[PDB]
């Protein structure tokens, strides 16, 4: 899923 949080 591209729009999952890509942060810590």
């Amino acid at each position, epitope marked *: 899923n*591209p*729009n999952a949080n890509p*942060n*810590a």
Partner: antibody, heavy 117, light 106 residues
Framework: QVQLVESGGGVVQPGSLRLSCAASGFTFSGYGMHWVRQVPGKGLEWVAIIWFDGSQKYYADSVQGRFTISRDNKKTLFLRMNSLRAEDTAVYYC????????????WGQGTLVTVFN | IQMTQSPSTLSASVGDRVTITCRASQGISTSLAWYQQKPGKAPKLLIY???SLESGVPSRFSGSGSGTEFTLTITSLQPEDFATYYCQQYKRYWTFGQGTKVEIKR
């Protein structure tokens, strides 16, 4: 002090180029980053995103298998542009992802990419 | 998912109340952001989650709406607010509206 300095833009042939994005003022290793391009006189179009990890790469339908997104947590974001097509002439912005919601908050100054046929 | 803004352009004076609307195809709940961009400059985030104000943004900017329709409101328009405004969804990938250019009335 969140700063995004872009570089690497220029003119090429229908060629290869690599844009840089030097992040400062925040822990670059903990956030994901974006590349968004804007055709002069037109709106905004997203290009690529990678996690803080480097594990999940996702590109738009138009730059798949040509541009590649990378990062050297040198605290710099890269986009190696290869096999440049005509429709890729735009100002390229690197952008940071917000804390709460997964969208862009801070944007780079943007460097121009021009593809002369 | 594509975003349609209304109007595309509008003229206003300093101190006016201006309103920008954004209609999304398919519901996006509150996964909407508003951006500001002046010519030759990078866009700046004003509103996220439809109504949450980004830090540093002046209090005269506010967002509303949920589902498919959304509204950016600017109270007491300032000379530095003449610019183009974009709405954006971040439910599936990232899609922007066509932009609304706020121009100076005379």
């Amino acid at each position: 002090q969140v700063q995004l300095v872009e570089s690497g833009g220029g003119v090429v042939q229908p060629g290869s180029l690599r844009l840089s994005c030097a992040a400062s003022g925040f822990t670059f290793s903990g956030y994901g980053m974006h590349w968004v391009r804007q055709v002069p006189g037109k709106g905004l179009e997203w290009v690529a995103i990678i996690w803080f990890d480097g594990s999940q790469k996702y590109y738009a339908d138009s730059v798949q298998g040509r541009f590649t997104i990378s990062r050297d947590n040198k605290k710099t974001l890269f986009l190696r542009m290869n096999s440049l097509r005509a429709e890729d002439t735009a100002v390229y912005y690197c952008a940071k992802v917000h804390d709460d919601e997964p969208t862009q908050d801070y944007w780079g100054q943007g460097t121009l990419v021009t593809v002369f046929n | 998912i594509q975003m349609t803004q209304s109007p595309s352009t509008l003229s206003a004076s300093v101190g006016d109340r201006v309103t920008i609307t954004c209609r999304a195809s398919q519901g996006i709940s509150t996964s909407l952001a508003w951006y500001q961009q002046k010519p030759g400059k990078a866009p700046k985030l004003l509103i996220y989650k439809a109504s949450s104000l980004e830090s540093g943004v002046p209090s005269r900017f506010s967002g509303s709406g949920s589902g498919t329709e959304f509204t950016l409101t600017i109270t007491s328009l300032q000379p530095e607010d003449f610019a183009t405004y974009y709405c954006q969804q971040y439910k599936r990938y990232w899609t922007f509206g066509q932009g609304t250019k706020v121009e100076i009335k005379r």
